[PDB]
Each structure stands twice: as structure tokens, then as C-alpha cells.
């Protein structure tokens, strides 16, 4: 939920920062300079991805042979569909009763 | 077998070694690029040693 989305956003931001640092290093070392030293840090950012790789290497890996999270748990979804259907049926019955009452006048 | 590009390259190399400009070249830009390349090489050597 929260932690999974946070780690995903963190990995996405890490990839974006790595791409930006690579582009900046290319633009700096292409033409003209001490700032090019920070370009080396871009390579360090690449190592961060490797750490993420390590983070993916020594990750959960529950089975690594099948798919986890058994069951879509959509029984609740089906129950909600039935509830909405009952609500619609009640609305239809109420509309019929209202038409009958209006005809009574 | 026409080889017009070869003749054009030979003329460009034999006229002034650049075919455009003699004293109005990028010698200062070249020196700045060489200094930037030396700085980048020093930074890369430091990063490799680290």
C-alpha cells in the first residue's frame, strides 16, 4: 500500500535523477572547468541503481517459481455489485410506486 | 570514379589546413577546450583512484 508505492516512487525518482545526471555529465564533458568533477558523481548515481539491483537481489523473493498474492479477493467486489444491483432494483420499484401514486391523483 | 570529394578534402587541407580563416580561427576556444579536457582528465583520474 503506502510502503510499496513509496519504494516504487523512490526507484522512479532514482532512475530519473540518474538519467538527468548522465545528461548533465554529457553536456559538461562535451564542450566548455571544475564542475565536471560533479559529473563523476553521476557515475556514483549509477552505482545507486546497482544498490537498487542489490535491493532487488536480496528482496523478498517469496517463491521465485510462482506468483504470490493468492486470490483477487474480489468477492467483496462481487458483493458490491450485488448491493448496487439491489439499490437499482429498489430505485426501480420506488419509481413504479411513484408513477402509480401520480396516476392516483 | 569521379572522386570530387577527395579533391575537395585535399584542397581544404592544402589551402589553410581548414579551408576557412587563417588568423580568425578558434585558437582561444581550442585552448579553453584543452583546459577543460585537462580538468576532466584530472577529475576522472581522481574518481578512478577513489
- Measured between CA atoms, how close is A22 to chain B, in angstroms? 15
Q: How many CA atoms does the CB half-sphere of B25 hold within 13 Å?
A: 11
Contact: B33, A31; criterion CB under 8 Å:
yes
Instruction: Nearest chain A residue to B43 by CA: give it.
Output: A37
List the resolution, Å.
Answer: 4.7
A17 vs A19: CA distance, rounded Å: 5
Q: How many CA atoms does the CB half-sphere of A57 hold within 13 Å?
A: 6
Which chain B residues have a beta carbon less than 8 Å from that of A37? Answer: 39, 43, 46
Cell numbers standing for residue B6: 577527395
Contact: A37, B46; criterion CB under 8 Å:
yes
Q: How many CA atoms does the CB half-sphere of A22 hold within 13 Å?
A: 10
Cell numbers standing for residue A49: 541503481
* Best CA proximity match to A41, nearest among A53, A52, A29, A56: A29
* Best CA proximity match to B26, nearest among A74, A31, A54: A31
Amino acid at each position: 500500500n503506502e510502503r510499496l508505492r513509496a519504494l516504487e516512487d523512490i526507484e522512479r525518482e532514482i532512475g530519473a535523477i540518474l538519467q538527468n545526471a548522465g545528461t548533465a555529465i554529457l553536456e559538461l564533458s562535451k564542450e566548455k572547468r571544475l564542475l565536471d568533477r560533479q559529473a563523476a558523481a553521476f557515475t556514483t548515481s549509477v552505482q545507486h541503481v546497482e544498490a537498487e539491483l542489490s535491493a532487488q537481489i536480496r528482496y523478498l523473493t517469496q517463491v521465485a517459481t510462482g506468483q504470490p498474492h493468492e486470490g483477487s479477493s474480489y468477492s467483496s467486489r462481487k458483493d458490491c455489485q450485488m448491493a448496487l444491483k439491489r439499490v437499482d432494483y429498489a430505485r426501480l420499484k420506488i419509481s413504479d410506486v411513484a408513477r402509480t401514486c401520480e396516476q392516483m391523483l | 570514379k569521379p572522386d570530387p570529394e577527395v579533391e575537395e578534402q585535399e584542397k581544404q587541407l592544402t589551402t589553410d589546413a581548414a579551408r576557412i580563416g587563417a588568423d580568425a580561427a578558434q585558437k582561444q576556444i581550442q585552448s579553453l577546450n584543452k583546459m577543460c579536457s585537462n580538468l576532466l582528465e584530472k577529475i576522472s583520474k581522481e574518481e578512478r583512484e577513489s
